[PDB]
Amino acid sequence: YQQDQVVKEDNIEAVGKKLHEYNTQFQEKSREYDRLYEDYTRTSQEIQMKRTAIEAFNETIKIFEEQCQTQERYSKEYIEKFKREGNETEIQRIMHNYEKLKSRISEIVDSRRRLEEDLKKQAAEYREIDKRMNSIKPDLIQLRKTRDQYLMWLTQKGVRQKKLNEWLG
Amino acid sequence: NQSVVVDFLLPTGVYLNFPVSRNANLSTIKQLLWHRAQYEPLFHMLSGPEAYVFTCINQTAEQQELEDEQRRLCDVQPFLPVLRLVAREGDRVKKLINSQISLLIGKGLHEFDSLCDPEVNDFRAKMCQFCEEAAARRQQLGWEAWLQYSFPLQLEPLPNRALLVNVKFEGSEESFTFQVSTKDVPLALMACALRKKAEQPEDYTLQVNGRHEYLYGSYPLCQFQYICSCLHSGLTPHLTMVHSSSILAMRDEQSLWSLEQPFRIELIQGSKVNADERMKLVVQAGLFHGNEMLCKTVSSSEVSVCSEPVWKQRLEFDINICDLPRMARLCFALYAVIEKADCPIAWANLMLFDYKDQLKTGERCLYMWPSVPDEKGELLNPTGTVRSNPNTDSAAALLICLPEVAPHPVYYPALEKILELGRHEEEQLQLREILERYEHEKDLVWKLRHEVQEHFPEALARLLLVTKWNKHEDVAQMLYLLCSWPELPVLSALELLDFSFPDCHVGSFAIKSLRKLTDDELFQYLLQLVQVLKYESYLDCELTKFLLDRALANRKIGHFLFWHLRSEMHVPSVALRFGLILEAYCRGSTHHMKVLMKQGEALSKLKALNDFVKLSSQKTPKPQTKELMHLCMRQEAYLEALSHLQSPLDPSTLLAEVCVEQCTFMDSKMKPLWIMYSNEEAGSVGIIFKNGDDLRQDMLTLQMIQLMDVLWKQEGLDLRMTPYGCLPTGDRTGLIEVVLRSDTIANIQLNDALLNWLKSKNPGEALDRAIEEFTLSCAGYCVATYVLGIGDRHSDNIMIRESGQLFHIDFGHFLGNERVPFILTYDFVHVIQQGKTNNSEKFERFRGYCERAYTILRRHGLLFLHLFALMRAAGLPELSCSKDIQYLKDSLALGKTEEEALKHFRVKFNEALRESWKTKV
Numbered sequence A: 001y002q003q004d005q006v007v008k009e010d011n012i013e014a015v016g017k018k019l020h021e022y023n024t025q026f027q028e029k030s031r032e033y034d035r036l037y038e039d040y041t042r043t044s045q046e047i048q049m050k051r052t053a054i055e056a057f058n059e060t061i062k063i064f065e066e067q068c069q070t071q072e073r074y075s076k077e078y079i080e081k082f083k084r085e086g087n088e089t090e091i092q093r094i095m096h097n098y099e100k101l102k103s104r105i106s107e108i109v110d111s112r113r114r115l116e117e118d119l120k121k122q123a124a125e126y127r128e129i130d131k132r133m134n135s136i137k138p139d140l141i142q143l144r145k146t147r148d149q150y151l152m153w154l155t156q157k158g159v160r161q162k163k164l165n166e167w168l169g
Numbered sequence B: 001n002q003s004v005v006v007d008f009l010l011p012t013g014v015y016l017n018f019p020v021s022r023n024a025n026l027s028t029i030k031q032l033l034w035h036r037a038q039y040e041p042l043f044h045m046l047s048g049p050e051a052y053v054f055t056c057i058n059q060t061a062e063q064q065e066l067e068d069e070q071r072r073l074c075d076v077q078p079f080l081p082v083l084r085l086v087a088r089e090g091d092r093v094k095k096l097i098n099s100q101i102s103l104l105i106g107k108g109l110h111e112f113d114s115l116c117d118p119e120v121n122d123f124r125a126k127m128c129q130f131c132e133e134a135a136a137r138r139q140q141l142g143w144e145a146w147l148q149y150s151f152p153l154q155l156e157p158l159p160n161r162a163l164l165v166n167v168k169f170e171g172s173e174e175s176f177t178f179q180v181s182t183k184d185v186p187l188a189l190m191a192c193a194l195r196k197k198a199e200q201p202e203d204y205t206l207q208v209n210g211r212h213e214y215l216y217g218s219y220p221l222c223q224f225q226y227i228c229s230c231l232h233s234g235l236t237p238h239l240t241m242v243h244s245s246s247i248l249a250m251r252d253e254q255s256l257w258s259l260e261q262p263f264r265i266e267l268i269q270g271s272k273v274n275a276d277e278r279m280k281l282v283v284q285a286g287l288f289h290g291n292e293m294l295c296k297t298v299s300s301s302e303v304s305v306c307s308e309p310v311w312k313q314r315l316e317f318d319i320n321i322c323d324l325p326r327m328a329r330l331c332f333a334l335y336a337v338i339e340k341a342d343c344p345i346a347w348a349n350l351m352l353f354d355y356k357d358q359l360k361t362g363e364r365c366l367y368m369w370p371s372v373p374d375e376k377g378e379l380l381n382p383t384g385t386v387r388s389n390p391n392t393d394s395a396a397a398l399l400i401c402l403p404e405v406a407p408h409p410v411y412y413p414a415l416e417k418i419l420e421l422g423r424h425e426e427e428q429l430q431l432r433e434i435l436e437r438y439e440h441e442k443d444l445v446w447k448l449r450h451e452v453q454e455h456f457p458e459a460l461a462r463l464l465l466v467t468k469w470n471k472h473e474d475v476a477q478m479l480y481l482l483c484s485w486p487e488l489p490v491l492s493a494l495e496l497l498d499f500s501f502p503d504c505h506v507g508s509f510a511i512k513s514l515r516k517l518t519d520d521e522l523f524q525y526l527l528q529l530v531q532v533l534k535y536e537s538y539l540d541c542e543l544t545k546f547l548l549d550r551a552l553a554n555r556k557i558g559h560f561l562f563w564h565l566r567s568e569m570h571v572p573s574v575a576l577r578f579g580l581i582l583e584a585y586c587r588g589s590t591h592h593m594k595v596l597m598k599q600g601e602a603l604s605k606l607k608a609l610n611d612f613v614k615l616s617s618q619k620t621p622k623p624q625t626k627e628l629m630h631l632c633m634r635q636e637a638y639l640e641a642l643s644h645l646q647s648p649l650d651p652s653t654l655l656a657e658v659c660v661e662q663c664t665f666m667d668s669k670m671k672p673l674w675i676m677y678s679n680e681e682a683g684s685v686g687i688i689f690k691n692g693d694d695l696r697q698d699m700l701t702l703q704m705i706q707l708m709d710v711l712w713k714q715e716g717l718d719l720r721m722t723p724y725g726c727l728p729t730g731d732r733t734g735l736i737e738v739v740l741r742s743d744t745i746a747n748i749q750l751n752d753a754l755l756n757w758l759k760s761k762n763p764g765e766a767l768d769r770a771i772e773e774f775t776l777s778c779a780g781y782c783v784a785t786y787v788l789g790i791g792d793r794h795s796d797n798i799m800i801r802e803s804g805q806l807f808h809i810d811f812g813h814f815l816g817n818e819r820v821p822f823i824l825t826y827d828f829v830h831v832i833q834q835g836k837t838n839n840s841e842k843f844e845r846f847r848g849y850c851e852r853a854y855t856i857l858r859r860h861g862l863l864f865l866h867l868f869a870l871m872r873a874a875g876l877p878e879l880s881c882s883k884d885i886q887y888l889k890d891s892l893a894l895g896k897t898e899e900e901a902l903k904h905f906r907v908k909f910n911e912a913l914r915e916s917w918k919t920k921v
C-alpha cells in the first residue's frame, strides 16, 4: 500500500534504452547551457570593459572641459592687452586655436556616443542570454531528475554496472 | 601603422595636435612638443619643459601623472592619445603610487570610492595604515633582518662528505675554488674565502650568482637547496661574496535580547527579471548560520512573470530578533514556477548585522547572482558570497526592507555582555565513544560540553556543530567556553576555517592557533588560506589581517599572495574583496610593487604575442608563424618588457635575456608559448606561457605532490620528485616551469627504448644512479597519482629527466574524474629491474618504497582532507562536494586500521603487477 509512479517503460531493456535516450538528451542540454554560460560570462566581462571605457571618455572630456575653463580665464587679459598695441593677429590665432580645441571635444563626444550605443546593444544581449538560460534550466533539471530515476529503477531491479555504463557513456 | 596623432593641452589654454611615434618615450615627445609650441601662441609664458609633467587617462579610466619620462607611449597606453601638461606639484609619491596600484591590480582605485561604502572605506583606511606602518618599521631594520625579509632562506626539510666550491667577489674577474665539507656553517666558508691574498667575514653574505638566493644563518651547507641540488648531481657550487653595505643599497625603499518580536521582512519588488511569460515568479527566503538553517524557509505568492514584478509581502520567519546569531544570513532565491491551475532563476545573500555589529534596517536592494543548476539542487544557496553583484546596471535584483525594530539602533552584544550570560560516569563512557570515532548524540555532547573542554580539546568542531545557534541563550554558553578554550594544533585550526564555522569568534580562534606557523609551513597552505577568504562575511577580518601580516614579514609569501589574488581579479564575486587586499599589500610593499609591475607587463606582452600566434597558425604554416613571432619579439617595447625580470614562478630566479631564436609555441590545444632565457651573471631558464585554458587544477595537484615530497623527506625518504612551478596569473592565463633536459615517454619511444635512452644520458657508472632516480620517482608518482585519483595517464603526459627521474604533467582530471586503480606499467617495471626478467631484490625495494610512501601519507591523512575541504571554496568542477573529499578518505583508507590498510594496498599493488603484463599484449 505504497506508491510512486515515475518510470514510463516496464522492462530491463526498454528502461535501459530510455536511460540511453535521456542521458544523451541531458548531456546535449548541458552542452547548450555551458555554451551559453560562456557567452554570459564573456558578455559580462565585455560589458564591464565598455563601462570603464565610458568612465575613461568622461574623465578625458572632463580634462577638455578644464582646458576650456582655463583658456577663457587665462586669455582675457592677453586679448585685451594685444587689442591696444594693435596685434589683431595674436587675438585671431588664440580664438582659432580655441575653436580647434572645441572642435576636437565634439569628436570625443561622438566617440563616447558610439560606445554608449554598443553597451546599450550588448546589455540587450546580456538579458537575452540570461532569458535563454532560464528557459533551459527546467528542461536541464527535469532531464537530470529523470535520468537519475531510471538509474535508480534499474539499480533496484539489480542491473549490473557494465550494462548501466554502456547505456550512459 | 607606427605613428599616432596625439592631443597636447598646454597650461595657457593652448592646444596642439601633431603625430608622434608609438615607440617614442615621453621625454622625447616633450622635446618635440616644445619645438612645435614655439610657433603656437602664448609660448613666452610657459616655463621650461622640466617644470611640467604629462598627464593622461590610463586604461583604468584614471588620471595618471607620468613622472617617469623614460617610459614609452605604447607602454603608457593612455585611453585616447591625449597628454596634458600640469605642474610638478604636491605629494607626488602618494599620487604616483595610487596610479601604479590601479594599473597593477587591474582595478582602478576610484571604483572603490565610487561604491560610497563605509565598509570599503573603513577597510582601505585601517589596512593601508597598517601596511604602511609595517613598511616604515621594516625600513629601519638592519641588513641581516632585511635579507631575511627580502630573500628568506630556502632549506630542505644526513652524511658528512667533502666536495669543493667556487667562491668569488662582486665586480672581480678572479674567482677562488677550494675544498669544504657538506656540514660546514656558511660563516666558516666566508672566513676561508675572505683570505684573498694573505674587512671581516661577519659583514658578508653568500649569494648564489645568477639568482636572488642567499646563504646565511645558523644552518649547515647541505640543508640549503642550491648546495643540496648541486651535491646530488655532483656539480661545483658557484657562490659570490656580497658586502653588508651592498645590501643597504637594496634596502633603500620608501538591548538586542530585550527585542522578543518575531523576525520579519518586507519583500517589495523585483527588477530586470528575464523569464518565460507563461510561468510565474516566486521568491523563497530562508535564514542561515553557516551551512545549517536557523528556522523553516518561508515563501511568496505566485506573481506573474515580468521584468519588474511587485510582491509587497510581509515575510515572517519562525524565529525572534533576539534569537538571531551574530553571523545570521538572510538568503533569497528567485524561482520561475508553473501556476498549477522548477526553475531557479537567481539568488542573493545578506548579513542581518553589518560590519560594525549593527542589526541592519531600512531598504536594501540586493543585486542577485544567477543560479547555476548543480547536482545538489537546493532551494537556497547559503554558501554563496554575501557580496553584491557588481553588474548593477544590467543584472537582476530584489528590493527588500528590514523594518525598524526600535527607535534607537541596536547592536549585537559585546564580548563582556556575552561572557556575563555565559558563566551560567555513564556519561563519560557514552561521550568518549562518540568523540572516539546525530540528534540523540548532539544533546549528550551539549549537556557534557564542559567535559569536552577539559578532556576532548580537539573535538571543538563537533561541539560547535551540535550547538543550537538559533537559540541565543545557547550561543552565549558556547562562546563562553570558546574564549577560554585551550590552543589546538595547526591541524585542528585548518578544519575550523571551513564555512561550517562562520562565527567571528571561531575564525579568530582558528587564526590564533595558526600563528605558530612557520613561513615554510604557511606557504604549503597559502593557496587554501586565500580561498577561505571567499567564505568571509565582512572585508575587515582576522584572516585578511593574518595573511597581510605574514605577507609583509616575508616577501616570498607576499609574492604568491599577490598572484593568487591577482589571478582572480576578473571574477566578479571576489574582485572587490581581493582588490582591497592587493592595494594594502602594495602600500606596505612599494619595493616589491616595482618587481610585480615588471612581471605584469611581461605577462601582458605575452598574451598579445600568444593571440598573434593563435591567429597566424590558422592562416599560415608554423615556420613562417615562428619567424613572425620573433619579429614581434625583436621590437624595442616587446624585448625590453620580456627581458630582465624576476620570474613569477619563482622570484629568486632571474629571467635576464630572452633567446628569441629559441622561442616558439606548441601546436597544443591553446598554442602555449615556449619562452627561453639566459643570464651571463650565472642559468638557462625556460617558461611556458599558457593562455586560453585554466591552470588552477594543475597548481593544486603540484602543491599536493610538493607536500607529499616534504612529508616523505621529513621521514628521511627523498623519492626524487619533480614538483615543477605552475602559477595562474590571470583569466585563463598562467606560467608553467620548463624542466630542462626532459622529454615525454612517447617521444623517447618514437625515436627496449626507454632503457637505451638512459644509456646515452648516463654512460658507464652513471646508469646505476639513473635507475635508482627512476625507481624512487616511479614509486612516489605511482602513489601520488593513486591517492589523488589522477586518471588519464599515458606516454604524452608522463616525462622523464636525463638524470633518470620520472614525473607526471597535465593534471586536468583528478579524484577519479569511479575509482582509478593503482597502475604499474611494464615499461617502467622493465627499467626498475635493470632490464632483467626477474630482479626481485630490486623489485622488493620498489615495493618497499611504495608502501612506506603510502604509509606516511595516511599518518598525515586529515591534513589532506582538511586542505581539500577548504579548496571546495575555489569552485573547481572536480572538487565541489563531500564525494570528492570521500575519494581521499577511501584512497588513504583512513576508516581502516594501519595493518588493514597495508594488506589492501598490497592486494591492489599485486593486481597492478598482474594487469601490467595484460595491457602490453
Ligand SMILES: Cc1nc(-c2cn3c(n2)-c2ccc(-c4cnn(C(C)(C)C(N)=O)c4)cc2OCC3)n(C(C)C)n1
Pocket: B666, B668, B672, B688, B690, B698, B724, B736, B737, B738, B739, B740, B741, B742, B743, B799, B809, B810, B811
Ligand atoms: C597542462 C600542461 N602542462 C604542460 C607542461 C608541463 N611541463 C611541460 N609541459 C614541459 C614540456 C616540455 C619540456 C621540454 C624540455 N625539453 N624539451 C625538448 C625540446 C624536447 C628537449 N628535451 O630538448 C621539452 C619540459 C616541460 O616541463 C615539465 C612541465 N603542458 C604542455 C603540454 C603545454 N600543458
